[PDB]
Ligand binder design. Structure first.
Ligand code: LYS
Ligand code: VAL
Ligand code: CA
Ligand code: CA
Ligand code: CA
Ligand code: CA
Ligand code: ZN
Length: 314
């Protein structure tokens, strides 16, 4: 309990931004402006969660140790705004659930995750990753898992799990475009491999660039990565890219319909048609139905959904 205040800080990539805080003796990373609040915690290099609600003596967040917290807090706010403004959705559950994030998780931890209840961000080892909350697509990817878990409930294995992952990359990217800094169709480029320019974890525009399939005939069928959830997601990421941006892929031509309509179609599919066990063929059907609901059965939008899924062999 305290009074809402506005702090200032520097994020992982060195940019200054304002952050919404709460004052009660200390200034806490607690944003009361969005739903039931956005709360950012210090995990203090340990794996106990959530850790301590982030406290600061002066409401200025320019220390090196502060940067991952500033970005986890700020980009959760951006993500909240995207869902509210674009999709009329109030937080991940649709009922303004509090959004909780922990930073400084463990030592040298080269990942981030939604744990069923909150977001968690490693600092990276400084070679593979820098602190992972520095990437707006990463923050939005993880918070999108919460959305999925409350809605379609896609099981984290095999084709359902690859859809789960792709939904997170799709909305992660749409949020990155909403914020409009340096948007692209790549995943994690701002925090991956600080020694190497121009790479990323995954690509939506060309998944094969990083060894991921861009066609159903190239799907991974083994047991690694929960049946390739971060690998086979490339097939869906490519379809989504094609629906938005257009192109000819394996000789199948897709007329792009743009990002806003992509987001509308997939948000509707996610929230009205997908189920925990949906597979790729079922996703196609859900996307075709959603586009039909939104734009009509004779629409270009529907035609493009069908061409995009044809192009990737679904
Ligand atoms: N988030 C992906 C890629 C990160 C790999 C980090 N070492 C995964 O959990 O598989
Ligand atoms: C690192 C991040 C984008 C995610 N947890 C994987 O993929
Ligand atoms: Ca301070
Ligand atoms: Ca970018
Ligand atoms: Ca990106
Ligand atoms: Ca890099
Ligand atoms: Zn994920």
């Amino acid at each position: 309990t305290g009074t809402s205040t506005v702090g200032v800080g520097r994020g992982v990539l060195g940019d200054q931004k304002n952050i919404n805080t709460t004052y009660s003796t200390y200034y806490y990373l607690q944003d009361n402006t969005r739903g039931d609040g956005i709360f950012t915690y210090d995990a203090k290099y340990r794996t106990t969660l959530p850790g301590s609600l982030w406290a600061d003596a002066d409401n200025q967040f320019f220390a090196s140790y502060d940067a991952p917290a500033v970005d986890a807090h700020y980009y959760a706010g951006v993500t909240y705004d995207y869902y509210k403004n674009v999709h009329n959705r109030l937080s991940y559950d649709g009922n303004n659930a509090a959004i909780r994030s922990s930073v400084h998780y463990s030592q040298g931890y080269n990942n981030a995750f939604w744990n069923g209840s909150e977001m968690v961000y490693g600092d990276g080892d400084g070679q593979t990753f820098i602190p992972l909350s520095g990437g707006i697509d990463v923050v939005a990817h993880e918070l999108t898992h919460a959305v999925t878990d409350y809605t379609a409930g896609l099981i984290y294995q095999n084709e359902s799990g690859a859809i789960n992952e792709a939904i997170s990359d799709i909305f992660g990217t749409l949020v990155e475009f909403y914020a409009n800094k340096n948007p692209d169709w790549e995943i994690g480029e701002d925090v991956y491999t600080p020694g190497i320019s121009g790479d990323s974890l995954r690509s939506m525009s060309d998944p094969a660039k990083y060894g991921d399939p861009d066609h159903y005939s190239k799907r991974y069928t083994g047991t690694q990565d929960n049946g390739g959830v971060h690998i086979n997601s490339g097939i869906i990421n490519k379809a989504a890219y094609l629906i938005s941006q257009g192109g000819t892929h394996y000789g199948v031509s897709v007329v792009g319909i743009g990002r806003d309509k992509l987001g509308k179609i997939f948000y509707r599919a996610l929230t009205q048609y997908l189920t925990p066990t949906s597979n790729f063929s079922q996703l196609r059907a859900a996307a075709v139905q959603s586009a039909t609901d939104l734009y009509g059965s004779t629409s270009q939008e529907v035609a493009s959904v069908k061409q995009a899924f044809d192009a990737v062999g679904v």
